Symmetry: D3
């Protein structure tokens, strides 16, 4: 994400006030800081539209619901927080907002979610975040961590939460292998996802990606699958192995921030970055997020 001096003077939304980023703060009694106890969303602003905005806010509401966290706001109010954060920083384009809603402040740090004073802590950081396509062109080195995605009875990886050491530990190992991102296997040993992005492989003209049973169900992921199906591109959504990845023609990772990022290697096995099907899906994706489809909520 290619740097920008405007990032240094962005205003941050904190419980209704707009604060210089150097002074944007939360209490050391906040459930987020203490316990990792909240949910969050990343949404990208493209030519005056927030990409998949309503989808992201639905997901936030579902994730909060799953950990019995009261956002303290209607869907409309939650969206206006994001809209006002972009507006306050004069952003219409090339911008990314992180919306963080943590459970709130506690009289004393504990795990019990009932003992909360006020309501949810709401933070929105909006920044200038444009991927310089030298990063697109070279792509990512992936290493398959020894650390596994969890089953939902242990920790549901569909939740976009403030408790992220599970993923960070996978990343640390991949970095120590000389890589940029971690590929993770599911509890059965099949390819699941990456530590911060979803994972796709390309094999004989077809797009392969996990079931999503044991990883984050990214909106970029679901859009890319949808565009592929709509374009008549065969999709295999289900169980595949490292052997199938190693013999793949192409691969890429997805997320709101980078979009489609090519993979140049997995476990040291080279893949041509920006193969022909990655390019085709990339074209479809960028067309979709830059279009007047109102899945992309219009900025006031």
């Amino acid at each position: 994400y290619a740097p920008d001096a405007r990032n240094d003077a962005v205003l941050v939304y904190v419980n209704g006030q707009f604060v210089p980023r150097h002074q944007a703060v939360v209490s050391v009694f906040d459930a987020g800081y203490v316990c990792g106890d909240g949910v969050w969303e990343g949404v990208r602003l493209v030519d005056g539209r927030i990409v998949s905005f309503d989808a992201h806010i639905d997901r936030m509401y579902e994730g909060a619901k799953s950990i019995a966290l009261d956002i303290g706001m209607t869907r409309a109010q939650t969206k206006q927080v994001v809209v006002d954060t972009f507006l306050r920083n004069g952003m219409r384009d090339g911008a990314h907002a992180r919306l963080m809603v943590t459970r709130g402040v506690k009289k004393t740090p504990n795990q019990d979610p009932r003992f909360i004073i006020g309501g949810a802590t709401v933070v929105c950081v909006a920044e200038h975040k444009v991927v310089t396509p030298e990063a697109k062109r070279n792509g990512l080195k992936l290493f398959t961590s020894t650390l596994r995605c969890s089953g939902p009875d242990v920790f549901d990886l569909r939740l976009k939460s403030h408790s992220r050491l599970n993923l960070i530990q996978a990343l640390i190992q991949a970095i120590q292998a000389g890589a940029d991102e971690a590929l993770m296997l599911d509890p059965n040993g099949f390819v699941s996802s990456c530590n911060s992005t979803n994972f796709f492989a390309v094999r004989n003209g077809a797009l392969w990606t996990s079931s999503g049973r044991y990883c984050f169900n990214g909106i970029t992921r679901a859009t890319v699958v949808r565009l592929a199906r709509e374009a008549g591109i065969p999709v295999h959504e289900g169980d595949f192995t490292l052997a199938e990845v190693y013999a793949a023609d192409e691969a890429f990772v997805t997320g709101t921030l980078a979009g489609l990022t090519p993979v140049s290697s997995v476990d040291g096995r080279a893949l041509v970055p920006l193969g022909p099907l990655t390019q085709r899906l990339d074209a479809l994706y960028r067309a979709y997020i830059a279009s007047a489809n109102e899945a992309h909520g219009a900025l006031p």
Copy 2:
């Protein structure tokens, strides 16, 4: 933990400064708040000695090491932070300190642990925390959550971390069952631990507790096992079932904060709280933490 107006005016240690608790804050760019990315310790102050102090600080150093987090301080400096926090609030007794060390502030929120400006964020909250023995006498209702302790390849539960939604989710379900705390099973179905405390059962004069393979290895836990062995009390450290708990004579939970807290029921099956062996071990425990054993680091 029976309330105290002195709690409202405690000074909090934050990166070297002492701050009123109403104004003790960390950046919304801090790895703790964003990612749940740090380690912590609770230590109890008893008659001018910090209980098991050196043990807790060793554990912190090991946990930080496991997630490649630089505390940025020697063991001596880390202890002086705690000592000075107690000292600054005029505490010699009936006090508990939470020491929180999060990875630090980032230019932009991400998972990558390398992109850190300055070093570790260090917070120490010291409070007046005395359990009113009406809480001892009645004990806790436990419910066995459907949510499981993880294996170490998924998320090592020996780590005392800022990523706690795994445990909090277990708690939420136990509360909805009408209970106070959650009992958790290991991935094989055997009794592991509670969501915020360790778990013991008593059967025919013997103390039963998990292997600790799949839960937090509490210092209170290890002290209680040690005192029991030293007193000739038979200990079974290993795999046991809910059936064995349900047929138990007594049970209790351990942690720095409450010490030994009796259990009055598990899954609705009554147990006499403060049975005769809980009382005996409780006597030994309190004697140990109030003694001039220098495992209890002496306050300057």
Copy 3:
């Protein structure tokens, strides 16, 4: 399922004879009583027709086959036992028959299935069983037990057997949570079924239910899936989580006895009982069981 004094004088089929309910008995040497060793079926009589009758009898024959149990009767003879049980109690409507076929009497209690004198014990209990729709309207509290559905290499839950402590133990825990029925997870942590009924959730106008890989594949379940597809309702058969359940709009359970029973809560998270799609499917189901249909067996 709301009382009727005719229940006290029903005749029970026992190995070819019809016996007063207070005198209907099996030997203490019977494999059913000793070992839980048999299969059973519940079939409902509606307006002169046995609902899905041949489906139930095929299932019985497959289940018996799986545990190498010789029913001792043709499909025709098995059906006539049920038909004659209804007939003997003058039942045309609002009645339920339990058909129990246990392995038989043994010289001595053991598990060896070959040491059997005579054939299968065959019992049929028919009762007057109408759900008073105040039970429909208020619905069930569900609690997700810590006890799991098994895989087929442990014990295949497709079998409708006399060995039911696996399910009853899940129920006992849910009752102690203040609930009416137990929701059960599969060995991978995904929602599977209830202890005595199959489980559906409703989310965004679609119906969600397990794969059935790890639970009882109820005929009511399969009928409701078919009716939903018939009526243009999207159906998602597969792996879903407690998070997805907790965010659902409606939920209900299925079985021959109650039909569709709404769910009022799961793990303490409230759901409005008799939501709009539960109503719709309930209407379709009742129409189906009261129609002439070739799936239904005619009473003479």
Copy 4:
């Protein structure tokens, strides 16, 4: 268990009454028949003593407790049921009693354990059951079933219950392999137990048996381990494999009914039945069950 015509006329205890075996019956509404919903115990009478009697009754009370089943009786009363069953059939020796306590009768068959009329159904079948030591000498063929012991969160195998299709299905497969009993693996693939007995192997003059974390913790099992430790026979309670079994010098199975029964093969691999250590442990066991030990309950000389 080598046959005896007296078995045909034994009286059976059924809720306080003593009934001819041809007429010993339970209601078709009983949770035992319907749901497999009860616990049971087998106890052996040897020379006027019920072997390990209080241990069996403790186990019953714990197992009942685990499925929230009220036996309806004190430990004393439960024992008298067994004692009276032996007494009523004039049995002083060479006899086995199966005590079955099911949850009771229900107004309608369901799973809900609350809706019970009366109390527990209590049945006690006592029979003349003496193993003719030609059965000892030849021993059992074992086959390792594909069907697995469960973990405790699925179904705890320490419970001696009326729900036995889990074990029966393992047996069915072993019989179809030409064997007499099923060996079962635990969820991790280590040797656990047999479908109706516990399992021991002998290797390098030491005794090997499972941890018991994933199988029935037999009283015969616990006695054999204790006698071995008392006698300086090395005993290893823990995880071992089929490879270790296949290389073993001897093996045997334990249970109240047969005592120690030698194994003649596992998965087709021959083992000499009644090897030297099986014999030695067998001698110790029989001496123990024929002793005046206060683990054994006195039968009245009545």
Copy 5:
């Protein structure tokens, strides 16, 4: 595979040379012999065509790629090895070639795949292998081994490798049960495959086979599924149980060597061999392998 004296004098391809079968040899330093470290393929010659030839060669190249093994040859060259082996033995029909490519010779036996002198060892054994349809008619006894298919993070069973003790051990147990082949379960307990062939069951006029997530994805398997779908025979690729197998009307196993082989029993439960749907699929398969389809590679009329 019903015998033929010509098998005794076949020439074997060994790194470019054609050698009498009595003298076809590899070094004791070869990774294949030492470590089980190679991939292989079986291909069948039918009326001048190598059945599914390019599919087998694709699979080999993927499997080699998965264990970072350099075959040392283009796809073209690899095919010519097979073609020349058939040609050298004057085989136009009724013949099977096993192509074995092991990692090569090492200066010293170790696991490290880098320290290799020369390239891959390439062996091709072609034999006369025609199944006498008395073997078709009677079919196979299956026993479900206690030994399990692995997940891909333990050992991926899609790889056709020189490390086969995992499958052989399942076979050993099934033979000791009186059977001919082993049925294996997946890590979750569902039916996966057989130790040397894929597994199908027939139930209510539909064909059932595993997902293939936990077993060898046979080309015969994939062909049979495709022919069934093409013909409007319902096919269910997914998880099913032993209970479903035991209640099945028919079953069969697939592989390049035998084609479709009926099953006469599973765990002692009899199945009529060559049931009506097995026959129909068998007819379709034989027609397919005897067709001019561009899936099949031409053998020179040389």
Copy 6:
């Protein structure tokens, strides 16, 4: 293991004959080459004694027994093959023999073990193999592969077999991470062993190593455990984690070929090679293998 031109002219034992290394061959019909179907042993010759010789031969006999492979030889005859291989190459010291017994030649390649003509193929390769202690001093980089040790119902890793792609695949990944050897986890996630050697860690003056339930139970491993207990060093055989490894003071790997080899890093976390306890145990081991001891077999 540092080169010697005598290796080029060693004679190899092949079914009773002694053959030049360049001409030592097995049939392409041999179960070893085709199927990986055999067992092997490495034994080291030190100052006229074969280290732990009878232990290795007992192990071979047990492994063969487990896969129903008839060695075709008494223990005495098996040993004489090794002894004669050493003798024929004039080796008294600094030599290693690999004894390979594969199932034999088959009429046709298949997996069925009964279709064997003649008996076991027996091969013995003896070489001059001295570790130049610059290899000792620098030690090994370890990477924890994503590929797991199996349980015994999948494939028992106590067996020293000719089917080694399970271990080699773990190695390939570790090499691609920039490491020398692979650390492997057990099916529960705990540290098990290395791909070709056993694994120890040192923490606070104690030695830690796996239970051996899920890996090769090396003779060097058992010797080092025994020497440690002999020398008053606490030994912890059981389940431990990557976190515990990462915080360790030292680590090393064991095997007949190298003896004790220090570890310089695990997953990129540095460990000082030849720490004080590794040195101590290394001294004890070398003393042991150079002593007269009854465990050692005398060369004639």
